Amino acid sequence: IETVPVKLKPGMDGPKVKQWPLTEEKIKALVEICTEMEKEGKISKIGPENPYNTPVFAIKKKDSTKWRKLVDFRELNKRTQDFWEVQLGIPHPAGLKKKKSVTVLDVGDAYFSVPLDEDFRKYTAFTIPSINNETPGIRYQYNVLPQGWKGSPAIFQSSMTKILEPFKKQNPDIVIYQYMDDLYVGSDLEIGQHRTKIEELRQHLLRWGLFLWMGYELHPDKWTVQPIVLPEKDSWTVNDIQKLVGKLNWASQIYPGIKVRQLSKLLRGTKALTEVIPLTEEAELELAENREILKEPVHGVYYDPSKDLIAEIQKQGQGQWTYQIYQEPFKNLKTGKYARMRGAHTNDVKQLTEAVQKITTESIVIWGKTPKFKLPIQKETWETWWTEYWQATWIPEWEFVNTPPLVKLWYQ
Numbered sequence: 001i002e003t004v005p006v007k008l009k010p011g012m013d014g015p016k017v018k019q020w021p022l023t024e025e026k027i028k029a030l031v032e033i034c035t036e037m038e039k040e041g042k043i044s045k046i047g048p049e050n051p052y053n054t055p056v057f058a059i060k061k062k063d064s065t066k067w068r069k070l071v072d073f074r075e076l077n078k079r080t081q082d083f084w085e086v087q088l089g090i091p092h093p094a095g096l097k098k099k100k101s102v103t104v105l106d107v108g109d110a111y112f113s114v115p116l117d118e119d120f121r122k123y124t125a126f127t128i129p130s131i132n133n134e135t136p137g138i139r140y141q142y143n144v145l146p147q148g149w150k151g152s153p154a155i156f157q158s159s160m161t162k163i164l165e166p167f168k169k170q171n172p173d174i175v176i177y178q179y180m181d182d183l184y185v186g187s188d189l190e191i192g193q194h195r196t197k198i199e200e201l202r203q204h205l206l207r208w209g210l211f212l213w214m215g216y217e218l219h220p221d222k223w224t225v226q227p228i229v230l231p232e233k234d235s236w237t238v239n240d241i242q243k244l245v246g247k248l249n250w251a252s253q254i255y256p257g258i259k260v261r262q263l264s265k266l267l268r269g270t271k272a273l274t275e276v277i278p279l280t281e282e283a284e285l286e287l288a289e290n291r292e293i294l295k296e297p298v299h300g301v302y303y304d305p306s307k308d309l310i311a312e313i314q315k316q317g318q319g320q321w322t323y324q325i326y327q328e329p330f331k332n333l334k335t336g337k338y339a340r341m342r343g344a345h346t347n348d349v350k351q352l353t354e355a356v357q358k359i360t361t362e363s364i365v366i367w368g369k370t371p372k373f374k375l376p377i378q379k380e381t382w383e384t385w386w387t388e389y390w391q392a393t394w395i396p397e398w399e400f401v402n403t404p405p406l407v408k409l410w411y412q
């Protein structure tokens, strides 16, 4: 019934961010949603004296036909003061990523039951644009905790704790984590038992008085991790050996003891690329030692919470993508691959967008925060099409790589 005082970072004004073009469908959806939100008092109209703006658009969650309002709060989130609660910060559960199965639940509607600090409300302003700007955009601001804002989980946390207390005390083995609008509940239980406990939890949440019927099931135990592998052949061409030496040279930036000398000795002389070259004993041994080295993990790879997670993605063709999450160059915290087909067969951007979402989810389950993506796409293409395929209630940060990486085929 009482609002907690909120302010921005020192020397920082509120966000002013242009509303990007919206399609007719999304505009109608947002009008219909915001009308009812206004009726329910969640939002209120504002006047010209509010300069601030945050972009808004519409999406659809996993397996649903219902439009959902998504506000992109990234600017406000980085401009709003770092919010440390009575918690003094929560250690991110390291058991969450070790659980057999992890279900994602949307708790977002709970935020709307808690009022927002009056003086900060002006900073949450947003616009529903009109087609061809033929009418003034409809301007709103939030009277309650907005979805997507950094302050909402921080503020609501004290409530969420005592809301989840009975369920947590009843099932102590279950690990629960909260990121933005999402509640991640992991456990080792069988899928049926898991789903029953999940239904139990959402029913318990609805009894606590808070679309929560959805769920998203991961399996961190079955997650993809990639060692560096070398080919095994009975016959090597000059080309094969050249590619091998290239890969080993690249892998020597990671693993110290990699030696290409005896293998490069075979490349001496100018021969046809397709000519078969028999391996000398020294070369074979060198290769063996190299494999041995490649089986061990990387030296001195640690996660530092003070730094940024960086995710790189490569398009390998045939609907296949490779990715690496890392902090420092050639120190890989995680690597993986996606062959996924969901409605994505002919569309590169749909694939890349789903990939970005999955990687972000993984990164949230593991380190409790989102990576900065380097996307193998032109800025204009991505900026144009990514919102069409976005199903997630959060958004990460991204940049663009316009020069083809040589390391592409070395990860495939």
Ligand SMILES: Cc1cc2cc(C#N)cn2c(C)c1Nc1ncnc(Nc2ccc(C#N)cc2)n1
Residues within 6 Å of the ligand: 134
């Ligand atoms: C009604 C309207 C009038 C108007 C006058 C001026 C000026 N100067 C700019 N205007 C805009 C943007 C309008 N808004 C609006 N909304 C939807 N359809 C239209 N069509 C339309 C408008 C004018 C003319 C003529 N002559 C012909 C067709 N206009």
